[model samples]
Target: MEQQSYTIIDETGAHARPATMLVQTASKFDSDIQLEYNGKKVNLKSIMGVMSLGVGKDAEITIYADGSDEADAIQAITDVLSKEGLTE
Candidate 1:
């Protein structure tokens, strides 16, 4: 398993579009991935689950990946967030 915590920098936060982007990216991975916010966490591959958090600017989220493709999964997620300017 691997985990990394990131602070959201994007004003839009993990809104519908970004949450959809995250789910789409996560679904392609073989690993189990989750996003933790506050005291709640949800499957990164679930669009509904991700959006339920209502993540906003400056919110801190922790991403966790576990499985044979953990490294790749984590990196992919990181890349997407970085490219989207969602996390810093």
Candidate 2:
């Protein structure tokens, strides 16, 4: 198992399209993925679970993965959270 924390830099955070992007990326991994915030844990592969939190600017999220492709999964999610500037 591995985990990493990321701040929601995307102006809108993980909602709607961003949540969809996260779920899509997470689904590609063979590992089990989870996102944690405010004492709540959400399945990363479920867009509804992610969007339920209504994450916004500065909100912190931690991602966890456990499986053969855990590393790749973590990198993929980290990239999405950091690399993609929601609305430049």
Candidate 3:
């Protein structure tokens, strides 16, 4: 029950660079993380989304973490994400 989730809100808020940074930030934690796009889900660790994802506009990226730091990391990103222009 420690897991947390999020969605990419706003128009064309998808940015590989931002997502890449998000990918790196989440890398600091130890949890089973994954995300989906256009009905295709991929591992969060994959740079394909981090370094390779051209996220679609108004997307919903999933966050997977069933550990204690789930919310900690979650809010960390959520906080900065607000500053990122888009939201989750």
Candidate 4:
């Protein structure tokens, strides 16, 4: 598995739109993806699981991926946070 941390930078945090985007991104990969925060982990493909965390701006979230495309999955997630101004 590979893990990395990203601080949520979007004003709305992990709201429905971001969570939905995240899920859709994860769906494009074959690897297993998860996001972790406050000692809790949720499947990245589950919109509700991520949105339920109530992650706000500056919330540091750890993302992990396993299986064949683990690195690609992690990079894809990171790219969203980077390119979309969602995280630091």
Candidate topping lDDT:
1
Writing each residue's lDDT as its tens digit, candidate 4 over 1-88 gives: 9998888776665557767777788888899888888766988888646767667786788888986999988778788866655577
Error (Å) of candidate 1 at residue 43 is 0.7
What's the count of clashing pairs in each model shown? 0, 0, 0, 0
Poorest stretch of ten by lDDT in candidate 1: 47-56
Model 3 lowest lDDT segment of ten: 1-10
| Model number with the top TM-score | 1
lDDT tens digits, residues 14-63, model 1? Answer: 66677778888988888988888886688888854687766677787899
Query: If candidate 2 were superposed on the true structure by all CA atoms, what would the RMSD be?
Result: 2.7
Error of 1 at 56 (Å): 2.3
**Candidate 3: stretches off by over 4 Å:** 1-7, 50-57, 86-88
List lDDT for all candidates, in order: 0.80, 0.72, 0.56, 0.77
TM-score of each model, paired residue for residue? 0.87, 0.80, 0.61, 0.84
> In candidate 3, what are the lDDT values of residues 1-88, reduced to their tens digit?
2433445564663666666666676677665455555555665656655454444445555555545666676666567555653354
Ranking by lDDT: 1, 4, 2, 3
How many clashing residue pairs, candidate 1? 0
